[PDB]
Scaffold this active site. Structure first.
Site, PDB file in Angstrom:
ATOM      1  N   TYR A   7      61.277  14.972  29.107  1.00  0.00           N
ATOM      2  CA  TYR A   7      61.179  16.373  29.560  1.00  0.00           C
ATOM      3  C   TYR A   7      61.553  17.328  28.473  1.00  0.00           C
ATOM      4  O   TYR A   7      62.383  17.036  27.631  1.00  0.00           O
ATOM      5  CB  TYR A   7      62.051  16.545  30.817  1.00  0.00           C
ATOM      6  N   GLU A  12      54.298  22.370  39.041  1.00  0.00           N
ATOM      7  CA  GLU A  12      55.548  21.632  39.150  1.00  0.00           C
ATOM      8  C   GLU A  12      56.484  21.963  37.982  1.00  0.00           C
ATOM      9  O   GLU A  12      56.029  22.267  36.837  1.00  0.00           O
ATOM     10  CB  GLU A  12      55.278  20.115  39.198  1.00  0.00           C
ATOM     11  N   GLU A  13      57.790  21.840  38.233  1.00  0.00           N
ATOM     12  CA  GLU A  13      58.791  21.820  37.147  1.00  0.00           C
ATOM     13  C   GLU A  13      58.600  22.962  36.160  1.00  0.00           C
ATOM     14  O   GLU A  13      58.535  22.793  34.942  1.00  0.00           O
ATOM     15  CB  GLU A  13      58.750  20.433  36.441  1.00  0.00           C
ATOM     16  N   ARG A  73      55.497   9.321  26.543  1.00  0.00           N
ATOM     17  CA  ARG A  73      56.504  10.332  26.187  1.00  0.00           C
ATOM     18  C   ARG A  73      57.202   9.926  24.896  1.00  0.00           C
ATOM     19  O   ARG A  73      58.393   9.572  24.900  1.00  0.00           O
ATOM     20  CB  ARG A  73      57.471  10.516  27.362  1.00  0.00           C
ATOM     21  N   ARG A 106      69.626  12.654  34.072  1.00  0.00           N
ATOM     22  CA  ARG A 106      68.278  13.137  33.804  1.00  0.00           C
ATOM     23  C   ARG A 106      68.303  14.708  33.748  1.00  0.00           C
ATOM     24  O   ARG A 106      69.232  15.318  34.182  1.00  0.00           O
ATOM     25  CB  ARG A 106      67.275  12.692  34.868  1.00  0.00           C
ATOM     26  N   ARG A 151      53.973  22.312  34.921  1.00  0.00           N
ATOM     27  CA  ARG A 151      53.257  20.992  34.836  1.00  0.00           C
ATOM     28  C   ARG A 151      52.223  20.869  35.968  1.00  0.00           C
ATOM     29  O   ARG A 151      52.613  20.990  37.156  1.00  0.00           O
ATOM     30  CB  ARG A 151      54.307  19.925  35.010  1.00  0.00           C
ATOM     31  N   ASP A 152      50.952  20.622  35.628  1.00  0.00           N
ATOM     32  CA  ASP A 152      49.932  20.282  36.595  1.00  0.00           C
ATOM     33  C   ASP A 152      49.932  18.762  36.701  1.00  0.00           C
ATOM     34  O   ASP A 152      49.523  18.095  35.785  1.00  0.00           O
ATOM     35  CB  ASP A 152      48.565  20.828  36.174  1.00  0.00           C
ATOM     36  N   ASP A 168      64.664   8.066  43.609  1.00  0.00           N
ATOM     37  CA  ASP A 168      65.061   9.233  42.796  1.00  0.00           C
ATOM     38  C   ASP A 168      65.747  10.231  43.692  1.00  0.00           C
ATOM     39  O   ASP A 168      66.770  10.869  43.331  1.00  0.00           O
ATOM     40  CB  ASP A 168      63.863   9.950  42.168  1.00  0.00           C
TER      41      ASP A 168
HETATM   42 CA   LIG Z   1      48.878  16.745  34.031  1.00  0.00          CA
END
Ligand SMILES: [Ca+2]
Ligand SMILES: *[C@@H]1O[C@H](CO[C@@H]2O[C@@H](C)[C@@H](O)[C@@H](O)[C@@H]2O)[C@@H](O[C@@H]2O[C@H](CO)[C@@H](O)[C@H](O)[C@H]2NC(C)=O)[C@H](O)[C@H]1NC(C)=O
Ligand SMILES: *[C@@H]1O[C@H](CO[C@@H]2O[C@@H](C)[C@@H](O)[C@@H](O)[C@@H]2O)[C@@H](O[C@@H]2O[C@H](CO)[C@@H](O)[C@H](O)[C@H]2NC(C)=O)[C@H](O)[C@H]1NC(C)=O
Ligand SMILES: *[C@@H]1O[C@H](CO[C@@H]2O[C@@H](C)[C@@H](O)[C@@H](O)[C@@H]2O)[C@@H](O[C@@H]2O[C@H](CO)[C@@H](O)[C@H](O)[C@H]2NC(C)=O)[C@H](O)[C@H]1NC(C)=O
Ligand SMILES: *[C@@H]1O[C@H](CO[C@@H]2O[C@@H](C)[C@@H](O)[C@@H](O)[C@@H]2O)[C@@H](O[C@@H]2O[C@H](CO)[C@@H](O)[C@H](O)[C@H]2NC(C)=O)[C@H](O)[C@H]1NC(C)=O
Ligand SMILES: *[C@@H]1O[C@H](CO[C@@H]2O[C@@H](C)[C@@H](O)[C@@H](O)[C@@H]2O)[C@@H](O)[C@H](O)[C@H]1NC(C)=O
Ligand SMILES: *[C@@H]1O[C@H](CO[C@@H]2O[C@@H](C)[C@@H](O)[C@@H](O)[C@@H]2O)[C@@H](O)[C@H](O)[C@H]1NC(C)=O
Ligand SMILES: *[C@@H]1O[C@H](CO[C@@H]2O[C@@H](C)[C@@H](O)[C@@H](O)[C@@H]2O)[C@@H](O)[C@H](O)[C@H]1NC(C)=O
Ligand SMILES: *[C@@H]1O[C@H](CO[C@@H]2O[C@@H](C)[C@@H](O)[C@@H](O)[C@@H]2O)[C@@H](O)[C@H](O)[C@H]1NC(C)=O
Ligand SMILES: *[C@@H]1O[C@H](CO)[C@@H](O)[C@H](O)[C@H]1NC(C)=O
Ligand SMILES: *[C@@H]1O[C@H](CO)[C@@H](O)[C@H](O)[C@H]1NC(C)=O
Ligand SMILES: *[C@@H]1O[C@H](CO)[C@@H](O)[C@H](O)[C@H]1NC(C)=O
Ligand SMILES: *[C@@H]1O[C@H](CO)[C@@H](O)[C@H](O)[C@H]1NC(C)=O
Ligand SMILES: [Ca+2]
Ligand SMILES: [Ca+2]
Ligand SMILES: [Ca+2]
Ligand SMILES: [Ca+2]
Ligand SMILES: [Ca+2]
Ligand SMILES: [Ca+2]
Ligand SMILES: [Ca+2]
Lengths: 388, 388, 388, 388
Positions: free
Chosen positions: B321, B196-197, B287, B37, B212-213, B70
């Protein structure tokens, strides 16, 4: 170009940060991965490598059958980059060996590989891959060595070999090696002591080795010495007993603790003044679990009290051999000698229903910043296709 | 030898030229390829590499079973050359990690690998492969980081970590790192925001991060800051909403857009004045697909109008992603900072009938010459032999 | 460091000595080997490499199924050392490409990879792996290039692209490239001529290209040009016809020979004064056999007489594409430009009962010492396990 | 940079220390390993490599079927690091060859690869991988060479080729090669002698070669020569007969010993004054076992008495070809020429129930320190899955 100095002191640390994990067995379920034992790490001034012994068989193949001599003519010392699965496609050949040690003096690699018959085994020493000397058995009863890295200080590298019974008094020698040539050796005068599979590290221009008593000690023996091989011997005094098997923690001894003293597991510990960092299994009876314990008086006092424990592998998961390695200032840029350790996670026979036995590895370095305990076990799902 | 300066401005571009494609899954149907990933690309002054997380299992093997945490102790950060299938035979080990970032300062690689338990995870920082610092969780609730490259300017590298809920307010910190040592950190004062991220890139001696929210934003949050960690925060204003899931394009907000705001996908965007290049999925719900949109006022205005769209992956194919990477002048010979991006093409669970989940990768660089849209999807035929 | 000069003349030769053989298909029956096409060799001042196109599928895997577009988004240009089987474990990624060329100027590699849709394909040019320019289709009908090495002289590299029908008049351009940037191009004025898949080589500071007429020529077209792209065009005059398919040898033409002129195979030839070395298949109808013929007047005269033939592959074995490569003085130490060639040995569809099609390779260099003809065919035993 | 001098004398030794073991067949039961023959070792000033011939087939694959010509167009000379299993993933391509030699002059590698038909085979010589000369057959009857390393002295390298019957008188030439170009050759005047598969080594600025008489000698022929190719010939005089097959030890001859003189095995020996180190099989009839014998007068006297024997492979295990290699002072740092040897352990046909035949390898270096005999056999368990 320039020899590692070996004159700095061990770094002050508070805990152990994870350095590597190879997942060799999990990967070897499908990829082409050696069956290995003793995945010891050693470093130069530029990089670190994992050394290991293989029988030249791969996981999930018929040749991995383990009902064969440990001391076979097929056994070889090999090495690969730290953290990679040990495969024929990424591993370098070092020596023909059923017992081994290796270390880098700042200039080139010394490797020591012992092969030959039980009554006359020969250590072949290589420097930068070229044979530079041999040491033959002096008791005709299984010449053997550390299964971890030797220790180098200002161009001299040091190791310990044993010859004689693994269930009674044997003979122990320290060797001083320069550019792969033996320049000096001394036989320890150590009646009633037993040394096997020593983990040796440099600290302030001297070497300390912590070993396995396979005869009659459930605490670990030690030998320390300076560059001229003038030595001292004892056993770690703490009642936090270091070997496996062992009794429950209790009153220690600065000689061998006879209760559950027979057999053993290769291990290590780091001396800091009168204090000691001990790595040991969590089980008293099997090679299960792994933990680091700080005992602030445990080098010299025999109580069973300690102040810090950090979990490494849970008691529900298999562990195995472990050993020290260091990272010198020439590699790290620090002003002190960095202590690290590896652990072998043994899978397969005798504890599990397979035809084979192999180890994967994890390793950790000591730091003086925040750390955390966890369990980082092997993780393979046994048995494998070859065992069906 | 000399640090990347980090003082140039993003190159003027008109479109995106394809840089790499690894076909990792297609190759891994038969070859020995990791289940991976987050295949994020990062470059030095000499070369580019793909970093990734693996569970140390290979495609088409039983250990690739995805009904596992994970955040496991098996998870490792590894890297291989850009455009190659990620195998145990061509990948280097970087760190034990279930969340990671990496970046090169011109001199050596910094890697950041977070492992340990949810209530106390530790980031291990390495510089040139040697442990140089640790950062432990400060909220005891899943310390985590970018899953893409950190940003370096004149020898200081910068990253963003989060600790706290992924479905509510959390805590966000920026870290300044020199030779792998934390020299400064600041906690964002960002009530009602969620980070995030993050995808962070240098531009004219400052860093911009687009994130990212996961709580309540279907547009993307951003944080920008100078070398002393003095920062600004907002959300991308365009009505061309960047996250997945999201509503249909509509009126934007320079705060979080709550409609379809929960969950998210790691993503990026590049600010050029008041304008913005957005990479996003083509579907509003899954996605699927990938496109680049130029919105000449979209950093600061809330209309849904844009002027250029370039197809990258068709809506009938899986994406995943994506993240930014840059190519500095010290690598390219240009006088400006080159923007690039990677996309992960996720195959397997939860959308497809396999026991496993992995990504392959594609990447693109911005250019000011002629370009073309197309679809460059993963291309593996699922399910695989292990799923039968 | 210093550009290849490109100013020497082709070496006087008498015959062809074998340089390499990869046995890629035979090895790929069991090992992990790409399905490949166009294994063209190109060299730097230090080494030679084989470049190739793959669909990112391995031999003996389901993804090797050939009922798929040649011009797919999975297709990639990769390279590996000359003489090795092309595997994911020894091959480097170069570019996303369904048509390609590469060449080294003495300093770094230029690669050219064309991807995108038929109506708008884009060549991505890279120098030392960094994108440096793009060329987009100018007729919107399959922009395509050499499938062999471009030619470099004093830091400028030269190539030929085609855009338009493969069964009628098309458009042909020559490109001059410096440090991966297009500095000049010219469109050929070549009515009634057809150029595809050119084999171009430097000779005395000019380039000569020998190509494939897919429209209506069973002899080969050529274009030669100096550093300023001032050019000449013609067809090889010899009645020893060079393309496949072709008629039996007969009266030649210094224009296209229409008999059996449709379709073709990529090929090469070397001009020496009015004389020519032709490599061609042995069959007039299929890609079977390979031979080198010296025709001392064959560049300019139309008779069917020649003086030397050297066997390379017997007519009972499959051949395929072939192309020129050179070895400059900066690599060889010679005072002249060394001519070499590769041949692709195509196995599988359409001639054989498999789901796939791949090539292995052989290569030869011209020498002025003793040589010998033989047959060096692919040697795989078809079909393979995946075809059962 | 600087040529190996080649002017030192062989090191005084007392025995043989083990240098390598590759376990190639055992590993190749599962991994991707070539079927090989003649795994000869040769070294530069920096490293040693194993060279070998492959048919470009892997173990456990259908293409490993051995009912095929030895002299095929598929046969290639390849090399890999000493001690590694010979795989397509770690082996370099050297030359197309069914008979070969290689050696390093201090500057670059010379390789010699013979391919082509029996009536006209051509040796292609390469220096640093570039073709530098060819030698064509002069009797039109299987031009062939050493299958071990050539010998280099002050920039000139020397080898021996044979052309003519393997069961009667043939023709023998010595070649002097500089930067891969033949500078001189001489045809031996050796009536009634037979030379094949020579093992040649430098010693005090001259070369000594010990070879195989396939016609009518069960002792080994030798030829020695200086830099101008002025030579001497004879046969090793000892009654400790060196070839396989051979009679029981008995009265020797300084000409060919006709009893059991037909056929042979490639072998070597080292001359020290009037004394000789002989490596030979342990069986008189099959390629089984291997031993080193020191016969202090055996170069020149015909008695059957010797003084030292060291076991290498037990008579119950298969051996095969063996050859000399040296390690020069520029590699070792010694003041003398180090003698070493390799042995091929042949498995499969004709002695065992497989479709294939391959060798693994072991090697040893002479030392003047303690050593020990043992058996280090191949260790694979036959037959393999492909033979079922
Ligand atoms: Ca969102
Ligand atoms: C520890 O040793 C360092 C390094 O010593 C040098 O390198 C060794 C391999 C060996 O060759 C020594 O003999 C060398 O001196 C000491 O640092 C050196 O100290 C000397 C004496 O002052 C000085 O001239 C050098 O410049 C120093 N070199 C460097 C690189 O700093 C150091 O003093 C020793 N430290 C302790 C606590 O003993
Ligand atoms: C952007 O920075 C470059 C490079 O700066 C140098 O390298 C950095 C890593 C850091 O060490 C700086 O402190 C160095 O100056 C600037 O180029 C340099 O400019 C100085 C000042 O004129 C000059 O003396 C140097 O020769 C320049 N070096 C090079 C290689 O050109 C450049 O001016 C900066 N550009 C902008 C727009 O800020
Ligand atoms: C062919 O060119 C060589 C090399 O030319 C040099 O290197 C090139 C890449 C380019 O930079 C040229 O402009 C350089 O001159 C010629 O050899 C050089 O000749 C010049 C002029 O006499 C001399 O000063 C250099 O020393 C030479 N360099 C070397 C390495 O020999 C050569 O003359 C040319 N030959 C022909 C037939 O044209
Ligand atoms: C063996 O040869 C060495 C090395 O000779 C040099 O290197 C060779 C490759 C070749 O280029 C020779 O012509 C070179 O001389 C001899 O050592 C050299 O001896 C010369 C003469 O005294 C001296 O000037 C050099 O310094 C020496 N070089 C080194 C590195 O020591 C050596 O004498 C020879 N030994 C014998 C026993 O013949
Ligand atoms: C595993 O090996 C066991 C014994 O090997 C026996 O011993 C080895 C050293 C060889 O001599 C072999 O040929 C002998 O049969 C077997 O008992 C056992 O069956 C082997 N295979 C397994 C467990 O699958
Ligand atoms: C995939 O994994 C699932 C559960 O694993 C179960 O969980 C793992 C973590 C281990 O505890 C394993 O031993 C347990 O059985 C299974 O439910 C499932 O069957 C697995 N195999 C598949 C899907 O083929
Ligand atoms: C080989 O591929 C053929 C068609 O593929 C069909 O086309 C490809 C592009 C995909 O769309 C695939 O999913 C379609 O089924 C098949 O006709 C053929 O059966 C395939 N398999 C073989 C020959 O084994
Ligand atoms: C092994 O090879 C034998 C003969 O090959 C025969 O010869 C080769 C050179 C090819 O011509 C092949 O197509 C011919 O059939 C066979 O006799 C034998 O069956 C082969 N296979 C085995 C032993 O499994
Ligand atoms: C280190 O070894 C060198 C070289 O043998 C010697 O000169 C030097 O004194 C040693 N240094 C110390 C501190 O022992
Ligand atoms: C870059 O960092 C160096 C070294 O810390 C410092 O001296 C220099 O001023 C910095 N340059 C700029 C432009 O900030
Ligand atoms: C080769 O190129 C250089 C650099 O552009 C130029 O100065 C030189 O004149 C060129 N040489 C020749 C012979 O064309
Ligand atoms: C070695 O070769 C060199 C270069 O050809 C020559 O000058 C030299 O004399 C040779 N040395 C000896 C000792 O033969
Ligand atoms: Ca014990
Ligand atoms: Ca205590
Ligand atoms: Ca807008
Ligand atoms: Ca044609
Ligand atoms: Ca003619
Ligand atoms: Ca004989
Ligand atoms: Ca004798």
């Amino acid at each position: 170009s320039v020899a590692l100095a070996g004159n700095s002191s061990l770094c002050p640390i508070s805990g152990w940060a994870i350095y590597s994990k190879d997942n060799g067995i999990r990967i070897g379920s499908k990829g082409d991965v050696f069956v290995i034992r003793e995945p010891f790490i050693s470093c130069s001034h530029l990089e670190c490598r994992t050394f290991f012994l293989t029988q030249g068989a791969l996981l999930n193949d018929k040749h991995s059958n383990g009902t064969v001599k440990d001391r076979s003519p097929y056994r070889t010392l090999m090495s690969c980059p730290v953290g990679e699965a040990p495969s024929p496609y990424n591993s370098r050949f070092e020596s023909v060996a059923w017992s081994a040690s290796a270390c880098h003096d700042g200039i080139s690699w010394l490797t020591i590989g012992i092969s030959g018959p039980d009554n006359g085994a020969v250590a072949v020493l290589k420097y930068n891959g070229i044979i530079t000397d041999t040491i033959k058995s002096w008791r005709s009863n299984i010449l053997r060595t550390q299964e971890s890295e030797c220790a180098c200080i200002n161009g001299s590298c040091f190791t310990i070999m044993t010859d004689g019974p693994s269930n009674g008094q044997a003979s122990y020698k320290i060797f001083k090696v320069e550019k792969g040539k033996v320049v000096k050796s001394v036989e320890l005068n150590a009646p009633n002591y037993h040394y096997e599979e020593c983990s040796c590290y440099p600290d302030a221009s001297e070497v300390m080795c912590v070993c396995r008593d396979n005869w009659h000690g459930s605490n670990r023996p030690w030998v320390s010495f300076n560059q001229n091989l003038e030595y001292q011997i004892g056993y770690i005094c703490s009642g936090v007993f270091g070997d496996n098997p062992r009794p429950n923690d209790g009153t220690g001894s600065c000689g061998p603790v006879s209760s559950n003293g027979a057999y053993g597991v290769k291990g290590f510990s780091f001396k800091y003044g009168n204090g000691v960092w001990i790595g040991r299994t969590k089980s008293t009876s099997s090679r299960s679990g792994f933990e680091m314990i700080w005992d602030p008086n445990g080098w010299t006092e025999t109580d069973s009290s300690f102040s810090v424990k950090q979990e490494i592998v849970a008691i529900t998961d298999w562990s195995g051999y472990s050993g020290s390695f260091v990272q010198h200032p020439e590699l790290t840029g620090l002003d002190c000698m960095r202590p690290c350790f590896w652990v072998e996670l043994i899978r397969g026979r005798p504890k599990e229903n397979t035809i084979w036995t192999s180890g994967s590895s994890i390793s950790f370095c000591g730091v003086n910043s925040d750390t955390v305990g966890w369990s980082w076990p092997d993780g393979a799902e046994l048995p494998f296709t070859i065992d069906k």
